[PDB]
Amino acid sequence: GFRKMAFPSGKVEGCMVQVTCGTTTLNGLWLDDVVYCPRHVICTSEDMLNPNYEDLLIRKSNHNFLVQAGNVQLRVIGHSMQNCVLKLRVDTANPKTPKYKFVRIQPGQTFSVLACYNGSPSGVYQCAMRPNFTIKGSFLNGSCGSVGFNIDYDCVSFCYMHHMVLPTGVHAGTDLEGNFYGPFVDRQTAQAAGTDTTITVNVLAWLYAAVINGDRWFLNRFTTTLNDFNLVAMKYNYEPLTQDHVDILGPLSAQTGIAVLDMCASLKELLQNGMNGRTILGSALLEDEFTPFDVVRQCSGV
Amino acid sequence: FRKMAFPSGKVEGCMVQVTCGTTTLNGLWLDDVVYCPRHVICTSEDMLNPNYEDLLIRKSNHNFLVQAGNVQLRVIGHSMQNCVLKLRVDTANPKTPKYKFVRIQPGQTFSVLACYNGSPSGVYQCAMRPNFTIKGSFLNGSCGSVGFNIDYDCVSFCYMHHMVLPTGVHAGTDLEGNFYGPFVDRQTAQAAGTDTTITVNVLAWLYAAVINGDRWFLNRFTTTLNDFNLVAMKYNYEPLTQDHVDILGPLSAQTGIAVLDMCASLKELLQNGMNGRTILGSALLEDEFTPFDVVRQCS
Numbered sequence: 001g002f003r004k005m006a007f008p009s010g011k012v013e014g015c016m017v018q019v020t021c022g023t024t025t026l027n028g029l030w031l032d033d034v035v036y037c038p039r040h041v042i043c044t045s046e047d048m049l050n051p052n053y054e055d056l057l058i059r060k061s062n063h064n065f066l067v068q069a070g071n072v073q074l075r076v077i078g079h080s081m082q083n084c085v086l087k088l089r090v091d092t093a094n095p096k097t098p099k100y101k102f103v104r105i106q107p108g109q110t111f112s113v114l115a116c117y118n119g120s121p122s123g124v125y126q127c128a129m130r131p132n133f134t135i136k137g138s139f140l141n142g143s144c145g146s147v148g149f150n151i152d153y154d155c156v157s158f159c160y161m162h163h164m165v166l167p168t169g170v171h172a173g174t175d176l177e178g179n180f181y182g183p184f185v186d187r188q189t190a191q192a193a194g195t196d197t198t199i200t201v202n203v204l205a206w207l208y209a210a211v212i213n214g215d216r217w218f219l220n221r222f223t224t225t226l227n228d229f230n231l232v233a234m235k236y237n238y239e240p241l242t243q244d245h246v247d248i249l250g251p252l253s254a255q256t257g258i259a260v261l262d263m264c265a266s267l268k269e270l271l272q273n274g275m276n277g278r279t280i281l282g283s284a285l286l287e288d289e290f291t292p293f294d295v296v297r298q299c300s301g302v
Numbered sequence: 303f304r305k306m307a308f309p310s311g312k313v314e315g316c317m318v319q320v321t322c323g324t325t326t327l328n329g330l331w332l333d334d335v336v337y338c339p340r341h342v343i344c345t346s347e348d349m350l351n352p353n354y355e356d357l358l359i360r361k362s363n364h365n366f367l368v369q370a371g372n373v374q375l376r377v378i379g380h381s382m383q384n385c386v387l388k389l390r391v392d393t394a395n396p397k398t399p400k401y402k403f404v405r406i407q408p409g410q411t412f413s414v415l416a417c418y419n420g421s422p423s424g425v426y427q428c429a430m431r432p433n434f435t436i437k438g439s440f441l442n443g444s445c446g447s448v449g450f451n452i453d454y455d456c457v458s459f460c461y462m463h464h465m466v467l468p469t470g471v472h473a474g475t476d477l478e479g480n481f482y483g484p485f486v487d488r489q490t491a492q493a494a495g496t497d498t499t500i501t502v503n504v505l506a507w508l509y510a511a512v513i514n515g516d517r518w519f520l521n522r523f524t525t526t527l528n529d530f531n532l533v534a535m536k537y538n539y540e541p542l543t544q545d546h547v548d549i550l551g552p553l554s555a556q557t558g559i560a561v562l563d564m565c566a567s568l569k570e571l572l573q574n575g576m577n578g579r580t581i582l583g584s585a586l587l588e589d590e591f592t593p594f595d596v597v598r599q600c601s
């Protein structure tokens with residue numbers, strides 16, 4: 001009765017194009033008269049090991065970039081690099097360009113991913129940016145250039161572009177200005193993510209959503225101190241709970257009659273003894289990919 | 303591995319607002335027809351025992367206010383097909399995609415575009431449960447929201463939302479207005495049958511876990527189909543049929559694990575639980591991915 005909901009994807013679907021350079025095909029994002037895509041599209045197998053992208057780009061020309069929107073070919077009249085993103089200038093402005101901004105998100109915030117292949121949208125799902133700056137996506141070959149976004153009213157906030165796959169199976173990318181999320185680089189080399197942690201404030205938000213929807217068994221009368229909860233958090237690899245987090249949860253603590261430090265004692269108990277044979281909102285683990293705002297959005301229908 | 307919905311743009315261009323009396327809900331505008339639930343014409347006095355043929359014949363075209371965005375559509379005529387109402391308008395939707403109306407079977411999956419006042423709110427993936435309900439996320443005013451699949455560029459609409467059952471699950475019709483399951487559009491006490499786990503779907507998901515590189519749940523045993531079903535039914539699992547066995551053939555060939563060997567693994571997972579481990583990010587056995595879904599996401 002509570003579900004992981006993605007944003008409707010129509011405004012973004014109209015921006016997805018296909019970009020080919022040599023033997024590599026991936027996706028581009030077409031806004032006004034520019035197509036954005038990962039700079040590593042210009043790499044060959046023998047350059048992926050240790051690229052010199054400035055030197056690679058200087059060697060490329062406008063006509064080494066084949067851009068197709070549907071079955072209509074877009075002519076590239078210029079090319080430039082911003083950090084790890086390639087900007088391809090095209091002759092035509094996208095008539096479907098929505099109101100949009102480029103925004104860099106924070107670990108713990110959520111967004112929708114429009115997975116695409118060959119310039120064609122194929123699925124949409126909701127993700128969180130993990131504390132270790134990876135995302136636990138579902139991506140196949142040719143998925144590079146797929147974007148993540150939020151919607152606010154009529155404005156699309158683009159926050160993510162997909163670049164690569166870490167050997168642990170999680171995913172890494174940049175914002176739309178080409179800055180990486182996390183301590184990763186675009187070359188084929190030994191890279192590992194840092195130890196992940198659980199997004200504490202999101203777990204609490206989800207526990208409030210369970211209360212709102214009629215699960216109440218984990219609740220208990222005991223409260224706790226922020227100082228004492230954060231010792232338990234450290235042991236179980238949870239992010240520390242700050243006083244900003246407690247304030248953010250204010251609107252849900254009011255609507256349900258449960259103080260944050262009380263819910264923290266419930267969460268402490270679940271970390272120690274487990275769920276003692278139960279589920280919560282149809283899950284047998286503690287969900288951390290719903291933000292406080294997500295819980296309201298879904299419990300209010302914005 | 304994720305619960306992945308279809309891109310919703312083709313359906314967003316068809317969502318409108320339908321108002322009758324003091325009731326507002328959602329409509330699906332395709333060509334020069336707007337489809338919506340017929341209970342839009344009930345008053346607060348008409349919800350236990352409506353006679354819909356008597357309520358409709360009293361209505362005039364102008365009693366229905368239809369709004370696409372901020373533009374108001376003029377209703378030309380109206381007719382009822384089973385439990386859906388069909389409002390003819392003077393303008394064909396210019397954004398009408400290629401589409402078909404299909405009726406799905408229990409176990410089958412689809413995407414839902416939840417809408418309020420004709421405006422899309424969110425999209426998620428869903429399955430027709432064996433008791434003919436769905437486990438959706440629906441608030442007041444969501445009636446008229448639809449479920450769909452997309453193949454190539456063709457939208458196959460399969461579900462329109464009508465009501466909320468006391469257990470908190472949801473009931474609706476296909477786009478010809480026939481209810482899924484034994485339900486009716488009256489606010490009388492209505493019973494969702496006992497629900498059960500979609501066995502063929504759980505097996506396909508285990509195969510997906512093998513494809514993605516987890517083997518920890520396999521064992522050295524096999525089973526007869528008969529012995530498997532005798533065990534599974536004690537956990538409220540649906541019977542597995544020979545049809546289901548045939549459906550899993552492709553996935554059995556990819557992974558090299560016979561279907562009845564995978565049934566043995568599931569028999570053992572039901573007996574043992576997870577022992578702290580996880581399978582594709584879940585600590586429960588997931589039953590809302592079909593054999594087809596698994597192939598599309600993994601390949």
Ligand SMILES: *C(=O)[C@H](C[C@@H]1CCNC1=O)NC(=O)[C@H](CC1CCCCC1)NC(=O)c1cc2ccccc2[nH]1
Pocket residue numbers: 026040043048139140141142143144145162163164165166167171185186187188
């Ligand atoms: C985008 O199209 C893909 C996304 C990959 C492919 C399918 N699943 C994913 O996670 N990105 C890549 O293929 C990159 C291309 C590189 C070019 C040079 C700069 C860095 C990116 N390659 C990889 O992501 C990759 C990961 C990996 C892990 C272990 C061994 C090899 C390997 N290659």
Ligand SMILES: *C(=O)[C@H](C[C@@H]1CCNC1=O)NC(=O)[C@H](CC1CCCCC1)NC(=O)c1cc2ccccc2[nH]1
Pocket residue numbers: 327341344349440441442443444445446463464465466467468472486487488489
């Ligand atoms: C559509 O807008 C709603 C969807 C409901 C709202 C809350 N959660 C849902 O899934 N549908 C309704 O409100 C219907 C109204 C019609 C039903 C058929 C006959 C004419 C009116 N009502 C319900 O969904 C409803 C009422 C009710 C009363 C007591 C227990 C459960 C219950 N469900």
